[PDB]
Design a protein around this ligand. Structure first.
Ligand SMILES: */C=C\C1=C(C)C(=O)N/C1=C\c1[nH]c(/C=C2\N=C(C[C@H]3NC(=O)C(C(*)=C)=C3C)C(C)=C2CCC(=O)O)c(CCC(=O)O)c1C
Ligand SMILES: */C=C\C1=C(C)C(=O)N/C1=C\c1[nH]c(/C=C2\N=C(C[C@H]3NC(=O)C(C(*)=C)=C3C)C(C)=C2CCC(=O)O)c(CCC(=O)O)c1C
Ligand SMILES: *[C@@H](C)[C@H]1/C(=C/c2[nH]c(/C=C3N=C(/C=C4\NC(=O)C(CC)=C4C)C(C)=C\3CCC(=O)O)c(CCC(=O)O)c2C)NC(=O)[C@@H]1C
Ligand SMILES: *[C@@H](C)[C@H]1/C(=C/c2[nH]c(/C=C3N=C(/C=C4\NC(=O)C(CC)=C4C)C(C)=C\3CCC(=O)O)c(CCC(=O)O)c2C)NC(=O)[C@@H]1C
Ligand SMILES: *[C@@H](C)[C@H]1/C(=C/c2[nH]c(/C=C3N=C(/C=C4\NC(=O)C(CC)=C4C)C(C)=C\3CCC(=O)O)c(CCC(=O)O)c2C)NC(=O)[C@@H]1C
Ligand SMILES: *[C@@H](C)[C@H]1/C(=C/c2[nH]c(/C=C3N=C(/C=C4\NC(=O)C(CC)=C4C)C(C)=C\3CCC(=O)O)c(CCC(=O)O)c2C)NC(=O)[C@@H]1C
Ligand SMILES: *[C@H](C)[C@H]1/C(=C/c2[nH]c(/C=C3N=C(/C=C4\NC(=O)C(CC)=C4C)C(C)=C\3CCC(=O)O)c(CCC(=O)O)c2C)NC(=O)[C@@H]1C
Ligand SMILES: *[C@H](C)[C@H]1/C(=C/c2[nH]c(/C=C3N=C(/C=C4\NC(=O)C(CC)=C4C)C(C)=C\3CCC(=O)O)c(CCC(=O)O)c2C)NC(=O)[C@@H]1C
Lengths: 63, 176, 63, 176
């Protein structure tokens, strides 16, 4: 049956072939033959967004 | 795809990091390996734009949804809808990453119609939000949106775009 | 002198007078005489945004 | 303002929470107390829109800045600039919250011209981005932006808007 925990797979694509790197750029996995490239997937709770909720309410009529 | 199934079954926030030989196998095991990555990026890197625009279009085409007793009346209900929209979007985006909809159907769609029906979440507004997201994701995969662009090598991604519309269609079918 | 740590004061305004609350809605401070209202300030490091950076590069010509 | 001073000097991520009598006193000692909260919200709730649009405007008005070796050529420099815009933007927003520019000048502006000069950050482009943010923040405080709106009791916020432009003027003067 469907889950009820508001969790969804959060996919993050990383293309760092231009050379700019940070602490998260290494050690997470091997890069053999795919330098600067990575797919990250995790299950995370999608929270409520008061700011966006209020913004749509006030702004939905402007395309 | 055992690495993804691991972190999706556990649902504890653990990340799977796919690079190197793993990533190389992945792009060979799905179709259009490199383009598929750019298509997935088209979606998730615009997640907030996609969600905000769809729910806004759903409401502007039917302002009753935000009238008292409406489907998105009050920040609480509007916030829950934006959350559902992103949940649906990210399950669609994982389907395009993995090349099948099994997680989308099982973990997101199985029993979603009854859930919405018992709560009275209007099916017409829901289908419309899905439709706007679908249209939006179609322009971004093709890099044809009017404002925000994506820089990728030139070529055709129409097959991946169709696969993406199919996952949106399963959402649409599922919520009737 | 200015710091060099890329840290800036992050102000968050909270207006929850419509009643919708979450775990952070209580215990952070007293609300006597200002129900639903709070100003949060902290010093956070402003990180790099690869996605926005790439987006600006590809999209700056579209207002 | 001892609570703010503590967390700003410590700069360790410890948040200060102002509610109730503390918040009542805070709004009491600055001008237009409640409207000031709405003006600060107008800024910070749009921090990415303001920053994105200004740095985008700086480049589109002078694309030499994104030509090879330009000030924002390559993602690292473009990211550094967007971050600077948000840094400056948020110091402006703390000034409008607190009613003075001392933290802005002491912790953000003091010596920023010499830093930019030694790094080759073009002063004209910087002033232009600051200029666009100033205009953009001005529309949001007045709730006159074209697309994103804020719902607040009707009234006049020109004084807070002018005070906000004043803090931006201090940035411009410091960046020469
Ligand atoms: C984050 C938003 C977008 C940026 C940035 C960008 O460049 N494109 C963006 C969005 C986008 N929207 C659509 C399609 C639709 N958006 C709709 C909502 C909009 N229309 C309205 O009438 C109102 C209320 C006044 C709105 C908020 C609607 C209804 C659609 C049409 C959907 C459909 O075809 O059924 C697209 C796809 C079309 C395009 O490429 O421009 C994008 C990319
Ligand atoms: C996140 C953006 C905004 C939303 C959403 C919204 O409703 N308003 C938004 C932004 C906004 N921008 C401005 C003013 C300017 N923005 C500029 C950049 C833009 N113009 C260009 O030519 C290019 C490059 C092609 C751009 C990316 C510029 C140049 C300005 C004018 C600044 C000035 O006066 O010198 C405002 C304020 C004006 C208004 O109310 O529309 C807002 C609110
Ligand atoms: C209901 C689901 C709506 C919603 C609520 C929501 N609020 C937050 C976060 C915060 N709210 C406050 C407000 C207060 N805390 C207090 O102690 C007081 C009394 C003095 C108030 C008014 C604060 C400070 C936060 C931030 C918490 C923090 O800094 O750690 C969230 C985020 C999650 C959380 O529970 O912290 C949410 C979801 N959001 C919506 O979209 C609905 C409209
Ligand atoms: C449709 C989505 C659009 C499009 C895509 C497109 N991409 C390529 C080529 C490549 N794309 C990548 C991207 C990645 N591979 C990865 O592993 C990751 C990280 C997870 C990314 C971001 C790569 C590596 C290539 C190969 C070339 C290179 O080395 O850079 C093409 C070219 C054809 C092909 O199959 O290679 C295309 C067409 N192009 C469009 O015009 C659409 C808007
Ligand atoms: C340079 C300053 C640019 C930039 C970089 C940047 N990257 C991240 C985050 C991540 N990068 C990766 C990429 C990899 N990790 C690996 O192990 C490999 C090799 C196989 C790659 C390609 C990952 C996985 C992350 C996320 C880390 C995580 O999930 O914990 C950041 C964010 C901060 C961080 O270091 O994590 C940044 C800033 N961003 C820019 O704007 C520059 C263009
Ligand atoms: C200019 C910015 C725009 C504007 C503002 C405006 N606001 C009010 C009134 C109030 N605003 C608040 C908001 C808060 N107080 C807080 O402590 C917090 C949390 C930190 C918030 C969000 C409050 C409480 C009021 C008082 C009224 C009420 O109880 O709701 C006014 C009315 C005049 C006044 O000074 O009170 C105005 C004019 N209005 C616009 O039209 C501008 C776009
Ligand atoms: C937005 C376009 C529409 C909308 C949404 C809306 N949904 C709810 C409530 C729920 N949504 C779900 C959905 C999921 N939860 C999950 O865990 C998953 C899979 C991971 C999904 C798909 C559920 C379970 C609920 C009920 C429980 C909950 O609220 O969290 C609401 C709130 C309904 C209410 O009146 O209480 C809303 C508003 N509403 C619309 O009008 C749009 C068509
Ligand atoms: C963007 C509109 C413009 C631009 C910005 C840009 N800035 C840098 C580098 C730095 N920026 C700072 C600024 C601060 N650091 C802080 O901690 C604070 C507040 C306390 C501020 C205001 C500093 C110290 C640096 C140097 C060290 C660092 O990078 O963090 C860059 C990178 C420059 C380079 O070429 O290496 C850029 C690109 N660039 C433009 O072209 C715009 C005009």
């Amino acid at each position: 049956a469907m889950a009820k925990d508001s969790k969804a797979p959060v996919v993050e694509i990383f293309d760092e072939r231009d050379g700019c790197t940070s602490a998260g750029s290494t050690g997470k996995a091997s890069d053999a033959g795919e330098k600067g490239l990575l797919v990250k997937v995790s299950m995370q709770k999608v929270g409520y967004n008061a700011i966006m909720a209020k913004s749509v309410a006030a702004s939905y009529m402007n395309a | 795809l055992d690495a993804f199934s691991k972190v999706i079954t556990s649902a504890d926030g653990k990340a799977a990091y796919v690079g190197g030989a793993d990533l190389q196998a992945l792009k060979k095991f799905v179709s259009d390996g490199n383009k598929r990555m750019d298509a997935v990026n088209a979606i998730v890197s615009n997640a907030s734009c996609i969600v905000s625009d769809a729910v806004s279009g759903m409401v502007c085409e039917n302002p009753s949804l935000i009238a008292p007793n409406g489907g998105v009346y009050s920040n609480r209900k509007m916030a829950a809808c934006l959350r559902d929209a992103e949940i649906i979007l990210r399950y669609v985006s994982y389907s395009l990453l993995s090349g099948d909809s099994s997680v989308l159907e099982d973990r997101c769609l199985n029993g979603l119609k009854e859930t919405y029906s018992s709560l009275g979440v209007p099916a017409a507004g829901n289908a419309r939000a899905v439709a706007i997201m679908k249209a939006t994701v179609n322009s971004f995969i093709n890099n044809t949106a009017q404002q925000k662009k994506l820089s990728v090598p030139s070529g055709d991604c129409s097959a991946l775009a169709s696969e993406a519309g199919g996952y949106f269609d399963k959402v649409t079918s599922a919520i009737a």
